[PDB]
Design an enzyme around this catalytic site. Structure first.
Site, PDB file in Angstrom:
ATOM      1  N   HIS A  96       0.808  -1.206  -0.110  1.00  0.00           N
ATOM      2  CA  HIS A  96      -0.179   0.063  -0.082  1.00  0.00           C
ATOM      3  C   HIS A  96       0.790   1.269   0.007  1.00  0.00           C
ATOM      4  O   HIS A  96       0.268   2.438  -0.033  1.00  0.00           O
ATOM      5  CB  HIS A  96      -1.003  -0.043   1.065  1.00  0.00           C
ATOM      6  CG  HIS A  96      -0.588   0.321   2.392  1.00  0.00           C
ATOM      7  ND1 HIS A  96      -0.382  -0.832   3.376  1.00  0.00           N
ATOM      8  CD2 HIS A  96      -0.010   1.463   2.973  1.00  0.00           C
ATOM      9  CE1 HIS A  96      -0.028  -0.091   4.612  1.00  0.00           C
ATOM     10  NE2 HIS A  96       0.152   1.045   4.565  1.00  0.00           N
ATOM     11  N   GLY A 103       2.142   6.305   9.633  1.00  0.00           N
ATOM     12  CA  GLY A 103       3.677   6.101   9.317  1.00  0.00           C
ATOM     13  C   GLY A 103       4.273   4.893   9.917  1.00  0.00           C
ATOM     14  O   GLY A 103       5.264   4.471   9.390  1.00  0.00           O
ATOM     15  N   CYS A 132       3.657   1.741   9.328  1.00  0.00           N
ATOM     16  CA  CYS A 132       3.470   0.628   8.495  1.00  0.00           C
ATOM     17  C   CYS A 132       4.687   0.221   7.941  1.00  0.00           C
ATOM     18  O   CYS A 132       5.565   1.132   7.782  1.00  0.00           O
ATOM     19  CB  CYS A 132       2.348   0.927   7.323  1.00  0.00           C
ATOM     20  SG  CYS A 132       0.760   1.168   7.859  1.00  0.00           S
TER      21      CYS A 132
HETATM   22  O1  LIG Z   1      -4.131   1.541   8.676  1.00  0.00           O
HETATM   23  C1  LIG Z   1      -3.632   2.318   7.935  1.00  0.00           C
HETATM   24  N1  LIG Z   1      -3.103   3.377   8.796  1.00  0.00           N
HETATM   25  C2  LIG Z   1      -2.693   3.311  10.084  1.00  0.00           C
HETATM   26  C3  LIG Z   1      -2.567   2.177  10.747  1.00  0.00           C
HETATM   27  N2  LIG Z   1      -2.096   1.975  11.983  1.00  0.00           N
HETATM   28  O2  LIG Z   1      -1.771   0.739  12.612  1.00  0.00           O
HETATM   29  C4  LIG Z   1      -2.444   3.088  12.728  1.00  0.00           C
HETATM   30  C5  LIG Z   1      -2.594   4.185  12.254  1.00  0.00           C
HETATM   31  C6  LIG Z   1      -3.212   5.492  13.184  1.00  0.00           C
HETATM   32  C7  LIG Z   1      -3.210   6.655  12.614  1.00  0.00           C
HETATM   33  C8  LIG Z   1      -3.219   6.714  11.179  1.00  0.00           C
HETATM   34  C9  LIG Z   1      -3.215   5.531  10.421  1.00  0.00           C
HETATM   35  C10 LIG Z   1      -2.669   4.375  10.778  1.00  0.00           C
HETATM   36  C11 LIG Z   1      -3.746   2.720   6.425  1.00  0.00           C
HETATM   37  C12 LIG Z   1      -4.640   4.166   6.339  1.00  0.00           C
HETATM   38  C13 LIG Z   1      -6.006   3.883   5.714  1.00  0.00           C
HETATM   39  O3  LIG Z   1      -6.392   2.522   5.874  1.00  0.00           O
HETATM   40  C14 LIG Z   1      -5.637   1.593   5.592  1.00  0.00           C
HETATM   41  C15 LIG Z   1      -6.627   0.509   5.128  1.00  0.00           C
HETATM   42  C16 LIG Z   1      -5.581  -0.663   4.874  1.00  0.00           C
HETATM   43  C17 LIG Z   1      -4.188  -0.645   5.090  1.00  0.00           C
HETATM   44 CL1  LIG Z   1      -3.218  -2.112   4.704  1.00  0.00          CL
HETATM   45  C18 LIG Z   1      -3.756   0.487   5.637  1.00  0.00           C
HETATM   46  C19 LIG Z   1      -4.197   1.502   5.862  1.00  0.00           C
END
Ligand SMILES: O=C(Nc1c[n+]([O-])cc2ccccc12)[C@@H]1CCOc2ccc(Cl)cc21
Ligand SMILES: O=C(Nc1c[n+]([O-])cc2ccccc12)[C@@H]1CCOc2ccc(Cl)cc21
EC number: 3.4.19.12
Lengths: 304, 304
Positions: A41, A143, A145
């Site tokens: 992604h 950020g 990821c």
């Molecule tokens: O999940 C995502 N981000 C973030 C991940 N995590 O763990 C925390 C976060 C906190 C605060 C903004 C972002 C965050 C992105 C952002 C958009 O939605 C998805 C959907 C699927 C996939 Cl593989 C990644 C994402």
């Protein structure tokens, strides 16, 4: 003495973290040998995430569209490929700090350390477990990821997780280093709900053994049980069923303490039925399930 | 989202750990520049520990009696001196991996990471706090002495603790990097009991703010209190008194959440009086006090 939620020393993994940018999206990459692994992604905008066709989005990307920065120096990208939900960016320089490593796919109940990173820079290290519903309860912001989960056996780092997403409930989902998600999750901004987060019974038992080793013995009862009787109570409390494989795995802790596994099961059965009554076990008011039997043995013996 | 007990990345400190042996006693040393710091009890046998006269025992030791090994290579010791309860072994080689560093003496309630080591080799990393009774609740076995506690501000490692001993109650005691013990403890195998381990109120408040940021809001009450009214309840529950300095320090968390510090104090007052009622806050059934306001801000913002 004392028992802590302990993470592996992170140095060997810190030496692998890089920043990967594709267009306006920046995340973390893992640089091992001349390949940088990162969530696919990285090629998506926030709008693309709603319904991404990764193969199509990837057609519009060339080697020069992936910016890889290790420290404050840019790595030259000479190849790129998608493997499941990760991109592998072949760079022209082998990571000089590449530790001995393996890619492993862990089972639910297995623990690992996570080195949380932002812009290829480590922010912290914590220990967690792959939940029985294949989520993890981490600590990840925008950020983060591409941050990875790993275990270390002496000098070999076994990478087991790469962070990809947060579900609407604040729990986390990701893949192994071959890009396959743990559980049924997909890298799409769509409603995905987790299944039941049951308690890892074998891990609770291991931690009760750690408590006995460290002097917390108040919960030791005068009873025993059978696997079948125990499992009737375990199902009722949303605890994972205990198998003879779990009993075998707890054998070294049973031997160290002289407490038969089924006697410890009976003590756990009484803790479930009676509660803690305001008491604590190893400084916790709930039954901890993110220490495996191996972690308890390792921490109580001093494996480096 | 998610909130974890997070330790600093340990790599910078792993690069400083060495093994120090004097006679038949082996422990860990911290190698910074051309000096190796270690507990002065490295010169004692188990019998000596009962009533050691360190100045006298040190007379019988020469530079060549201190064996310092970094990895599997021996360092040449060209000088040695005792500073309080630590020995400083001057070596002929400056540690090539010496990070930017400071020696700081922390206050009770301050948190730090510990890189637990055995024979100069890192085994794990965990986060803990200097308790109000100047003990720490660590995880240390035989051979762990000389393991250090530290904090990192970007690229500067502030070393605040060096492990020396375990008390009969399984709690831990040690010194700052100038060799001064935290609290009234002495490096002698004699009965030393800890004082009251009160709860670090400002830290609990910071963690309740972290809970609100991460969505756990059930405990938010409709009340407010004053510092004096709150402190009457806090004393009764063996919580440290909250001062206007603590309120100031929580200002950024109050601003982020829109919850006034005294309103959060009233919610904490009700949690103390009513208990959790079987509920959890950030996956804990007790009020966590080993996250400072700075740790909550750092973890919730993503400082690397
Ligand atoms: O999940 C995502 N981000 C973030 C991940 N995590 O763990 C925390 C976060 C906190 C605060 C903004 C972002 C965050 C992105 C952002 C958009 O939605 C998805 C959907 C699927 C996939 Cl593989 C990644 C994402
Ligand atoms: O405390 C000591 N060891 C150890 C320390 N810690 O934390 C855990 C351990 C576990 C298992 C055996 C040893 C251990 C030594 C051992 C003897 O008694 C003293 C007294 C004072 C001083 Cl400064 C150090 C010591």
């Amino acid at each position: 003495s004392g028992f802590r939620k302990m993470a592996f020393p992170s140095g060997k993994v810190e030496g692998c973290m890089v920043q990967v940018t594709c267009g306006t999206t920046t995340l973390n990459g893992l640089w091992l040998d001349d390949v940088v692994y990162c969530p696919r992604h990285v090629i998506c905008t926030s709008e693309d995430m709603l319904n991404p066709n990764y193969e199509d989005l990837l057609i519009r990307k060339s080697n020069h569209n992936f910016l890889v920065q290790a420290g404050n120096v840019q790595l030259r990208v000479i190849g790129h490929s998608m493997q499941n939900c990760v991109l592998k960016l072949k760079v022209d320089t082998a990571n000089p700090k590449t530790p001995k490593y393996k890619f492993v796919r862990i089972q639910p109940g297995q623990t690992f350390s996570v080195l949380a990173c932002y812009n290829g820079s480590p922010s912290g290290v914590y220990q967690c477990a792959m939940r029985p519903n294949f989520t993890i309860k981490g600590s990840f912001l925008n950020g983060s990821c591409g941050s990875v989960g790993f275990n270390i056996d002496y000098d070999c780092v076994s990478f087991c997780y790469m962070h990809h997403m947060e579900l609407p409930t604040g729990v986390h989902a990701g893949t192994d280093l071959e890009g396959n998600f743990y559980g049924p999750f997909v890298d799409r901004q769509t409603a995905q709900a987790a299944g039941t987060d049951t308690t890892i019974t074998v891990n609770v038992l291991a931690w009760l053994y750690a408590a006995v080793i460290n002097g917390d013995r108040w919960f030791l009862n005068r009873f025993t049980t059978t696997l079948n009787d125990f499992n009737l109570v375990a199902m009722k409390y949303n605890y994972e069923p205990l198998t003879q494989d779990h009993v075998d795995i707890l054998g070294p802790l049973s031997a160290q303490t002289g407490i038969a596994v089924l006697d410890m099961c009976a003590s756990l059965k009484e803790l479930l039925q009676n509660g803690m009554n305001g008491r604590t076990i190893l400084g916790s008011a709930l039954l901890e399930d993110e220490f495996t039997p191996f972690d308890v043995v390792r921490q109580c013996s001093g494996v480096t």
